[PDB]
Amino acid sequence: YTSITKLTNLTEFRNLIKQNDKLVIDFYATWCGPCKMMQPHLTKLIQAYPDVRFVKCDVDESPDIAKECEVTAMPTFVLGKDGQLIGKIIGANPTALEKGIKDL
Amino acid sequence: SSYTSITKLTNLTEFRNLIKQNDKLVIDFYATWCGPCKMMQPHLTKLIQAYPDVRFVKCDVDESPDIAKECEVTAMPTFVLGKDGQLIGKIIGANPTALEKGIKDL
């Protein structure tokens, strides 16, 4: 979990979306229980889907990036496909998350 | 300050009792580490004022994980709505507009 890229500003954010055909952003907060539960799931998905770029973003540290993706709950996983925000998985939901990523 | 006076659900009995003893209810599922949850407080305060026929309570998911589990609370905040002895749906996230709409419809 500690090895994926953390988005910290809008420039990095916009760069990431334009440089990657398939992208997952994990929007979390420090000390968030459901967020932490999802870490080992994300690790496995990273390995299972090497053509998808997984990154993370701390909603308290980066409230502007959160607003830009309309993130209002934690954890939320935002799915990007070819520059578009194509889907959102709200909450610690491994099954919906895998399906969403599978379809990217 | 008004948020501090709100009844906390702390066990499953209180939870089932809440559901059996109130015609209309809202449970604010929050955590102490949750920023957007804190942002919702003034909105919850107002809703409590504005909806006297609806019973409002809160539940700290870390202090009452069994209740949070029963309501499949997987994202913070979550607001669970109840009516006439059953839970009817959830508003998920810091969204006071959607929350008020769900409450208005109770």
Strand-helix topology:
The structure is a homodimer.
Chain A lengths: L4 E3 L2 H10 L2 E7 L4 H16 L4 E6 L4 H6 L7 E6 L2 E7 L3 H9 L2
Could you please describe the fold and organization of this structure?
Chain A: The active site is at residues 32, 35. Chain A is built from four helices and five strands. Chain A is an alpha/beta fold. Chain A has one domain: Glutaredoxin (3-Layer(aba) Sandwich), CATH 3.40.30.10. In chain A, strands 1-3-2-4-5 form a five-stranded mixed β-sheet, with helices on both faces. Chain A starts with a strand and ends with a helix. In chain A, 35% of the residues are buried.
* CATH H-level superfamily of chain A: Glutaredoxin
The major sheet of chain A is characterized as: 5 strands, mixed
Sequence of strands across the biggest β-sheet of chain A:
1-3-2-4-5
> Shape of chain A from CA axes?
globular
Question: How many domains, in number, for the residues of chain A?
Answer: 1
The quaternary organization reads as homodimer
PDB class: electron transport
Keywords: electron transport, alpha/beta sandwich, oxidized, dimer
Assembly: dimeric
Entry title: Crystal Structure of Mitochondrial Thioredoxin 3 from Saccharomyces cerevisiae (oxidized form)
